């Protein structure tokens, strides 16, 4: 009965003050799916084309967001801006002006939370990413398509833009959409995936007609609908709070990552979006590569309202000198060191309100968070040349422990000792705040959190996971 | 100090139109005077320019239609942060 995509975003247990802006082709605003709940702003900025095809793309996506029978947020209020011409093509300048139009609308007649859907992409653009960042820092939520070229989303905009939610597309088999050379983009600039193939929605052929379309835009429209409902339940949510919820309520580890290029499987989130049913949120943040200098560093950072509770590193070469946490501009940052083709820094960023956190740098039977009422959330380690719950273990290395002020918090340390991949997982109800390896027979290539699972890669071996929960 | 940028995907570039971005604290009046200053210096050199839009609200700056030959002139203008050649976006 129910279209597959709407059933897939429904959680296994399940029970309007928000406006959704759409930057797209023209819309067939009187289509019965969306009639009455989409306001055409008649802003228009499109290049000239080098009638039912004209509004095909936009009408379908408005339906996916707000449609009465096949929408995600049925009844959600929308406003549309035309930035794509009848051939589906626009400009960065027109998109800039349209984004500026949204901000001027908000300044003239303020409303509630604003979700802006950007179902479009071009190459990496410095100015487009800067404008999305400023719109986001002004309180607007931006949701963008990852792109349709089976490529790294970091090479496209606004997909690569900082404070936006970038969404790739999966199909009915939870596998990434592919069409020969085309298919969903991937990589560390994608935040999550969503149903994006064979998505039924409003067809601009006729007022009651339906068509099946596919795209990372369709996937992003699912996330824009989920976000709109999340913001109606919690209008005070910040962007970092909303992104942490989207991740937390996603389906985990359902995507066959073999479709992605090998170097992109660790960087690409294995998440398929889902509505919430009817607490400590953490997320893994991957940095860009560092380069093959012996002093080359890589830096992963958190959102302004997020705490950095741990920091690890990974090199496929295995030639790495560890990682460390350090302040930069009044904020803790995850720095990783090359020995070696290069390394990634892997941050664990968490929403912990009513909590002060610190770094304690010391050698590895002592305790590294010695203050009272303080828990150890992460144990980093770095060394200079190339060869008991609140303490960090290590061999010549220097420890960087993250210690948090948190009266309502409880943390427990679980290791697992045994090879290319050892994993230990937090228990259900616990949040993985830190993931590290203990050196042994094998040479550790690195460690990283995958949701609440600590993963250590080698070439004994013990994975060490620090799990916390608000009691 | 001021830099130029254009899209790495050659078939997506739109030469002839440029987004002149100014430094963050630039007021809208300075943005408009910088653009008319560019128009004036371009006219002296025999070039025709058209200011298509002036930006304020998110980033200060303006959209200009002009020959690329003017880019080193425009990069020397006061308050300029960077200039970017317009490029294409597509329905995804």
């Amino acid at each position: 009965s129910i279209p597959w995509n709407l059933e897939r975003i429904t959680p296994p247990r399940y029970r309007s003050l928000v406006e959704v802006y759409l930057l797209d082709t023209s819309i067939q605003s009187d289509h019965r799916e969306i009639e009455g709940r989409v306001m055409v702003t008649d802003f228009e900025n499109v290049p000239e084309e080098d009638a039912s095809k004209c509004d095909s793309h936009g009408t379908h996506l408005a339906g996916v967001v707000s449609g009465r029978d096949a929408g995600v947020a049925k009844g959600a209020s929308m406003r549309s801006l035309r930035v794509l011409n009848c051939q589906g093509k626009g400009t960065v300048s027109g998109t800039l002006i349209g984004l500026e139009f949204i901000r001027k609308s908000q300044l003239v007649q303020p409303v509630g939370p604003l979700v802006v859907l950007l179902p479009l992409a071009g190459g990496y653009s410095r100015v487009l990413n800067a404008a999305c960042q400023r719109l986001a820092r002004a309180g607007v939520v931006l949701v963008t398509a990852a792109g349709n070229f089976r490529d790294d989303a970091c090479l496209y905009s606004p997909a690569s833009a900082p404070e936006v939610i970038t969404v790739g597309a999966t199909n009915a088999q939870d596998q990434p959409v592919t069409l020969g050379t085309l298919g969903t983009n991937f990589g560390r600039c994608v935040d999550l995936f969503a149903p994006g193939e064979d998505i039924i929605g409003a067809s601009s052929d006729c007022s009651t007609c339906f068509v099946s379309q596919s795209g990372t835009s369709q996937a992003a429209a699912h996330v824009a609908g989920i976000a709109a409902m999340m913001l109606s339940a919690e209008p005070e949510l910040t962007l970092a709070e909303l992104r942490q919820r989207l991740i937390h309520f996603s389906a985990k580890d359902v995507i066959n990552e073999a479709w992605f290029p090998e170097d992109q499987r660790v960087l690409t989130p294995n998440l398929v979006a889902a509505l919430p049913p009817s607490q400590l949120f953490c997320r893994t943040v991957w940095s860009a590569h560092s380069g093959p200098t012996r002093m080359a560093t890589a830096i992963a950072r958190c959102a302004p309202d997020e705490e950095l509770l741990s920091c690890s590193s990974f090199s496929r070469s295995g030639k790495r000198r560890g990682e460390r946490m350090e302040a930069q501009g009044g904020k803790l940052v995850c720095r990783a060191h090359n020995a070696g083709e290069g390394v990634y820094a892997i941050a664990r960023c968490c929403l912990l309100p009513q909590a002060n956190c610190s770094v304690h740098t010391a050698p590895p039977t002592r305790v590294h968070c010695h203050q009272q009422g303080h828990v150890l959330t992460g144990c980093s380690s770095h060394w200079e040349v190339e060869d008991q719950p609140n303490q960090c273990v290590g061999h010549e290395a220097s420890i960087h422990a993250s210690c948090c002020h948190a009266p309502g918090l409880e943390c427990k340390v679980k290791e697992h000792g045994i090879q290319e991949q050892v994993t230990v997982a937090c228990e259900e109800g616990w949040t993985l705040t830190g993931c590290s390896a203990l050196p042994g027979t094998s040479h550790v290539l690195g460690a990283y959190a995958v949701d609440n699972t600590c993963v250590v890669r080698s070439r004994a071996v013990t994975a060490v996971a620090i799990c916390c929960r608000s009691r | 100090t001021a830099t130029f940028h254009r899209c790495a995907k050659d078939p997506w570039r739109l030469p002839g139109t440029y987004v002149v971005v100014l430094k963050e604290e630039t007021h809208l009046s300075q943005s408009e005077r910088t653009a008319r200053r560019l128009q004036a210096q371009a006219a002296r050199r025999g070039y025709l320019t058209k200011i298509l839009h002036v930006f304020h609200g998110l980033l200060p700056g303006f959209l200009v239609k002009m020959s690329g030959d003017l880019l080193e002139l425009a990069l020397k203008l006061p308050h300029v942060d960077y200039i970017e050649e317009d490029s294409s976006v597509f329905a995804q």
Binding site: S56, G88, A172, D198, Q213, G215 | -
Partner: peptide, 10 residues
């Protein structure tokens, strides 16, 4: 798959 973003999908 439609060219506004023709092939069978799914």
């Amino acid at each position: 798959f439609v060219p506004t973003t023709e092939a069978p999908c799914x």
